[PDB]
């Protein structure tokens, strides 16, 4: 339990794997155990306000989460000055794989990944945490076919008892839900489920399903597939700040089921429910797990996928 005292020189730094919010992410090796790890650097020097409030939030959250599908911070180490958060090294991330064009995910692979992602998400949500940065690069996968939800840099505690105001510009654009694009600030864990619906769809098409550069363009792309936001499907939409300002081009009908007819029916039901415009009608993480697609997925009985040992 004695964190922060072990030195970083106890690790051999192999190379940079990522850019982090408050420092680089490194692949490294434990000199004593030989184990591969990831090191997330937290730079202190030349910070006006010292140890970053951002890292403080992340550390507070990480220490409260123990779940097999969620990243688990082993210890915090110091320079011989920066600090380094230590995690088990994961062979891949979803983005890299999907971009390698070396992998194809079977329906069985998808079920397994989704089952694990949603179980991790559900765990966080039940702990009253909003992730707020779900995307492919933040979902880690090992060669054993084990998934981990990563990057709690933007996560925050959410008041389930009574509504509170939160930061609106969260989630990378492509995975950002309609309520945020429309300016909601008293949003819910539903924002993360929308992000996951985007991953689900992306797993089937191998391309991000909504690709726009700006918010209005993003809302229009969402509208084109899911239908235009309107009171008929989303009564409370009229209460959102940008509802009149940001209006799609035509009043689109939902053609999600047509566009993704190539997807298996049970996967498609789940996708439909996850990409439901009205956050109050969008399924919860607990509900995804009770869907036809996931309810009978027996993880122990699944073959690992064929991932490169790159």
């Amino acid at each position: 339990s004695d964190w922060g005292k072990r030195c970083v020189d106890k690790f051999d730094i192999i190379g940079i794997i990522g850019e982090g919010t408050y420092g680089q992410v490194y692949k490294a090796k434990d000199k004593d155990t030989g184990e591969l790890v990831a090191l997330k650097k937290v730079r202190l020097d030349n910070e006006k306000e010292g140890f970053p409030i951002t890292a403080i939030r992340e550390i507070k959250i990480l220490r409260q989460l123990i779940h097999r599908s969620v990243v688990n911070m082993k210890e915090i180490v110091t320079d011989k000055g920066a600090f380094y958060l230590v995690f088990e090294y994961m062979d891949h991330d979803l983005m890299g794989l999907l971009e390698s064009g070396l992998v194809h995910f079977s329906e069985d692979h998808i079920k397994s990944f989704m089952k694990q992602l949603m179980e991790g998400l559900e765990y966080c949500h039940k702990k009253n945490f909003l992730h707020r940065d779900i995307k492919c690069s933040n979902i880690l996968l090992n060669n054993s076919g084990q998934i981990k939800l990563a990057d709690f840099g933007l996560a925050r505690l959410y008041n389930s008892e009574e509504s509170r105001p939160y930061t609106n510009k969260v989630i990378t654009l492509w995975y950002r839900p309609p309520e945020l694009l429309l300016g909601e600030e008293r949003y819910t864990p539903a924002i993360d489920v929308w992000s996951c619906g985007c991953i689900l769809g992306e797993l089937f098409t191998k391309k991000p399903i909504f690709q726009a550069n700006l918010e209005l363009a993003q809302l229009e792309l969402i509208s084109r597939l899911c239908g235009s936001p309107c009171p008929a499907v989303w009564p409370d939409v009229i209460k959102l700040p940008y509802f009149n300002t940001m209006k799609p081009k035509k009043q689109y009908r939902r053609r999600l089921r047509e566009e993704f007819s190539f997807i298996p029916s049970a996967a498609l039901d789940l996708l439909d429910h996850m990409l439901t415009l009205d956050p109050s009608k969008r399924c919860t993480a607990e509900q995804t797990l009770q869907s036809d697609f996931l309810k009978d997925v027996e993880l122990s009985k699944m073959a690992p996928p064929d991932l490169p040992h790159w």
Partner: protein, 240 residues
Amino acid sequence: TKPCWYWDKKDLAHTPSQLEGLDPATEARYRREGARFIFDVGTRLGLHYDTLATGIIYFHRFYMFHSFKQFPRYVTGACCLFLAGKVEETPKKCKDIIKTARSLLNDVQFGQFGDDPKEEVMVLERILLQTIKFDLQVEHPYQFLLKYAKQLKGDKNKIQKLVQMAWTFVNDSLCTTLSLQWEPEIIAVAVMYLAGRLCKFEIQEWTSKPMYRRWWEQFVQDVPVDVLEDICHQILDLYS
């Protein structure tokens, strides 16, 4: 799992400061002074009770690992408040903590900060973080006093008086090493118990078991009366 942040009275007699020859009375004084300084600085900055208490808990824990002979108390106090502000989402600029400290302390007391007071605090933050082992989340007696007093059913005016007095006792407890000895849930019950005694209130009469003497057993498990008494004595010692 998580570090143990509780010590014996035998352990509290063997702090790094006593090992360096600081007598026990002087250490208690240094702690009262450091705690009251965090409370005073923080109050002037409009910080509220949880941030002040977190700052104070970090301060007391720090001195279980370091000596007052090596680490000037007000510098550590300022540093603990600064960190606590970030942890509790009520941040304050280090500049402003220094300015308030300059105003509250005499020239000798403020001498502790050296030539670059802000740098003195910032440099310590790395050490403080390592010392508290990155265990940032801390719960205080306040929330439990409120949660427990809410479940009390009886005369509104007496219950309010019990709580107001108990709250004052929590503020006092922060000056002692009580937070290094007992969990916040137990300190909360002890302050209710002390307030009830001084007010001559029968708290068991406000419960679902008016005939049951150990009214606190619905709030905390297996806490003997001698533990509550001990805590009471320690709080009362501040008034002696």
